[PDB]
Amino acid sequence: ESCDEMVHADSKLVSCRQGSGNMKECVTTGRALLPAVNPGQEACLHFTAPGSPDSKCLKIKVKRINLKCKKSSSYFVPDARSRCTSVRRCRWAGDCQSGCPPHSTSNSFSDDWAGKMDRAGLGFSGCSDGCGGAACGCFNAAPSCIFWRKWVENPHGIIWKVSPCAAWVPSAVIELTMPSGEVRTFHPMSGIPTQVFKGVSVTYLGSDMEVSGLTDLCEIEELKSKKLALAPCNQAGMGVVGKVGEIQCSSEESARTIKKDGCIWNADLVGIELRVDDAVCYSKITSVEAVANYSAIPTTIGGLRFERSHDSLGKISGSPLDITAIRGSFSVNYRGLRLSLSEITATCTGEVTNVSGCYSCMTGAKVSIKLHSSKNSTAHVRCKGDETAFSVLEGVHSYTVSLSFDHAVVDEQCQLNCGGHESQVTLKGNLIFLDVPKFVDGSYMQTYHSSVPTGANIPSPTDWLNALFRWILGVIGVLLGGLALFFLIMSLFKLGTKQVFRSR
Amino acid sequence: IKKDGCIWNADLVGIELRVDDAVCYSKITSVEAVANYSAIPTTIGGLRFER
Amino acid sequence: ICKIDGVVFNQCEGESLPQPFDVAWMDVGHSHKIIMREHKTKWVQESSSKD
Numbered sequence: 029e030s031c032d033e034m035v036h037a038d039s040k041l042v043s044c045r046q047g048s049g050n051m052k053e054c055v056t057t058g059r060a061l062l063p064a065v066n067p068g069q070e071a072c073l074h075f076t077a078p079g080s081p082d083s084k085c086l087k088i089k090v091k092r093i094n095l096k097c098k099k100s101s102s103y104f105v106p107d108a109r110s111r112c113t114s115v116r117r118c119r120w121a122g123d124c125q126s127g128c129p130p131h132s133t134s135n136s137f138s139d140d141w142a143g144k145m146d147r148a149g150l151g152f153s154g155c156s157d158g159c160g161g162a163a164c165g166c167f168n169a170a171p172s173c174i175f176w177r178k179w180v181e182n183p184h185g186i187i188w189k190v191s192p193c194a195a196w197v198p199s200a201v202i203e204l205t206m207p208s209g210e211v212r213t214f215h216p217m218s219g220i221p222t223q224v225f226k227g228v229s230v231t232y233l234g235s236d237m238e239v240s241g242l243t244d245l246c247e248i249e250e251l252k253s254k255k256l257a258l259a260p261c262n263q264a265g266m267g268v269v270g271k272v273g274e275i276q277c278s279s280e281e282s283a284r285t286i287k288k289d290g291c292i293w294n295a296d297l298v299g300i301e302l303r304v305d306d307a308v309c310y311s312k313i314t315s316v317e318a319v320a321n322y323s324a325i326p327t328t329i330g331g332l333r334f335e336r337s338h339d340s341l342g343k344i345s346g347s348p349l350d351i352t353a354i355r356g357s358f359s360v361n362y363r364g365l366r367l368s369l370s371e372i373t374a375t376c377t378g379e380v381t382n383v384s385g386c387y388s389c390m391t392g393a394k395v396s397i398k399l400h401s402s403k404n405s406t407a408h409v410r411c412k413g414d415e416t417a418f419s420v421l422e423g424v425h426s427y428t429v430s431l432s433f434d435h436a437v438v439d440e441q442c443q444l445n446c447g448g449h450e451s452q453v454t455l456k457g458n459l460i461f462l463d464v465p466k467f468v469d470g471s472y473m474q475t476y477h478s479s480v481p482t483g484a485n486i487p488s489p490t491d492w493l494n495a496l497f498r499w500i501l502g503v504i505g506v507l508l509g510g511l512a513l514f515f516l517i518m519s520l521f522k523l524g525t526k527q528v529f530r531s532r
Numbered sequence: 533i534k535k536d537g538c539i540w541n542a543d544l545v546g547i548e549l550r551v552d553d554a555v556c557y558s559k560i561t562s563v564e565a566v567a568n569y570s571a572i573p574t575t576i577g578g579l580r581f582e583r
Numbered sequence: 584i585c586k587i588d589g590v591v592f593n594q595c596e597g598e599s600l601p602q603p604f605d606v607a608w609m610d611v612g613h614s615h616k617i618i619m620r621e622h623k624t625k626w627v628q629e630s631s632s633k634d
């Protein structure tokens with residue numbers, strides 16, 4: 029589409045050579061700054077070389093500006109159950125004379141338990157006292173050593189993905205297109221590097237917007253059913269039992285098993301109970317739908333409406349009413365890149381065909397320009413009020429661009445130049461005025477709103493009172509019409525008073 | 533950023549993986565990210581900090 | 584990096600003395616090699632009959 033907000037910060041900053049024989053470049057390094065634009069615009073970065081007449085540009089596309097958060101940590105908490113077993117034996121020797129552990133023996137496995145398995149998981153080797161005598165099965169009036177082992181299992185295999193965060197910094201999407209032809213996408217943050225690709229390090233800056241009731245919130249998501257929910261989650265390994273934050277592990281593929289080497293649990297996550305050689309285990313682990321402040325996919329806590337935006341690396345978003353933020357300018361840095369220049373530009377001349385659009389408003393005024401040349405794309409339009417750059421194709425085609433005007437009757441003379449050749453163009457048409465749209469029920473904001481033009485807010489006497497019916501004749505006609513209406517309303521009022529007076 | 537001279541305490545880069553991916557996200561903040569970030573011309577209080 | 588054993592790689596407008604440089608590389612059967620710093624590898628057996 030169109031383009032605006034040119035920079036030209038590092039023009040004529042090359043140290044190239046003959047260029048592989050005919051024409052090439054080596055590297056271009058500098059720094060520029062891109063101001064904030066409305067969602068659905070393009071910011072071009074036009075370079076200028078001292079030898080070549082014109083060069084290509086670098087367009088920046090922004091679609092949505094959502095309110096996301098960072099990633100403090102990442103872990104997976106699997107579902108657990110209650111499993112336990114025991115064994116009843118007899119003393120029959122000096123191994124169980126008085127107590128089971130003499131001083132510190134915790135290895136309560138006599139090469140018979142089922143703990144030496146890959147699906148067992150984590151547990152605690154405990155022990156207690158039992159019965160001694162003929163009524164239980166032995167021949168000694170002394171308690172027998174009865175050991176017990178409990179653990180957790182996962183029959184189903186439901187895997188959850190929790191990501192704690194307490195920053196909630198503004199972010200957006202960027203569809204960057206390199207001048208060579210490659211087009212990629214990435215999600216920059218507010219002041220955080222965004223995986224620099226081929227030297228380009230375009231970053232986004234915010235305004236540090238405060239939150240109303242966002243203190244302890246997370247972005248726990250489900251993998252199988254793809255169910256999302258907003259609920260306060262725990263912190264890193266050093267945690268407290270009582271809320272979310274049960275037995276975790278290393279990764280998702282390692283979350284199917286609750287074995288050691290990756291799974292971490294502190295203490296007191298499963299209870300033990302026994303009356304007579306039973307050693308039964310009860311369940312105390314709570315599910316995800318058990319803590320307080322457990323929301324769902326649609327969340328309207330406060331002024332923010334947390335929706336579920338389909339996007340990679342993040343599935344949490346939200347958009348309040350029109351905010352009109354202060355500034356959202358970018359910052360682009362370069363380290364190294366290659367670009368080819370033709371420098372063989374020939375005679376080119378264009379003209380204006382159509383013109384339409386709004387007043388000085390959001391979408392602007394779109395103007396169609398037709399060109400004809402042999403070069404693929406060498407053009408740079410420059411005029412007063414606003415500057416717009418775009419790309420063309422080989423041959424004769426039609427192109428549509430948008431410019432910013434501040435007058436109803438757009439009748440001026442701009443200068444158009446493609447490559448090294450220059451010419452003159454003219455614009456002539458009628459435009460209209462559109463204000464900021466109003467809110468309607470049933471509709472919710474998706475990403476954000478940038479800004480709305482509400483500066484003038486005053487009627488223009490030049491455009492107004494034009495299609496109603498030179499100035500002297502108009503004043504005379506208005507005066508005659510006013511006198512006629514005055515006589516009419518006087519006659520009507522006299523008739524009304526006459527009707528009210530009589531026939532009482 | 534090699535060792536033997538560079539100093540970092542802990543928890544400066546996170547690890548994330550679902551199925552043999554091991555993707556790393558960025559958490560380091562730039563200089564223009566903390567609060568109370570002024571510029572070369574500064575007039576905080578009665579003092580006019582110039583360069 | 585500008586030149587590797589008398590082979591033009593980049594544009595530097597000047598050459599310096601040779602110096603060792605540790606970096607991984609791979610071949611695809613072409614003329615020159617391709618060096619790579621960040622790469623993710625995966626070992627697969629596939630139960631091929633050639634093995």
Ligand SMILES: *[C@@H]1O[C@H](CO)[C@@H](O)[C@H](O)[C@H]1NC(C)=O
Binds near residue numbers: 241260320321
């Ligand atoms: C739920 O939110 C309310 C309001 O913010 C808060 O007072 C309460 O402590 C929260 N509950 C939990 C368990 O954090």
Ligand SMILES: *[C@@H]1O[C@H](CO)[C@@H](O)[C@H](O)[C@H]1NC(C)=O
Binds near residue numbers: 381426
């Ligand atoms: C220019 O003429 C009208 C005016 O808007 C427009 O509908 C038409 O599509 C334009 N011409 C071409 C060739 O696109």
Ligand SMILES: *[C@@H]1O[C@H](CO)[C@@H](O)[C@H](O)[C@H]1NC(C)=O
Binds near residue numbers: 404422
């Ligand atoms: C111009 O475009 C045509 C077709 O898109 C392409 O074949 C040609 O290589 C382009 N020229 C240059 C110099 O890139």
Ligand SMILES: *[C@@H]1O[C@H](CO)[C@@H](O)[C@H](O)[C@H]1NC(C)=O
Binds near residue numbers: 567568
């Ligand atoms: C910024 O300055 C204000 C006023 O001096 C202070 O209250 C606030 O804590 C400062 N911010 C930080 C992050 O130190």
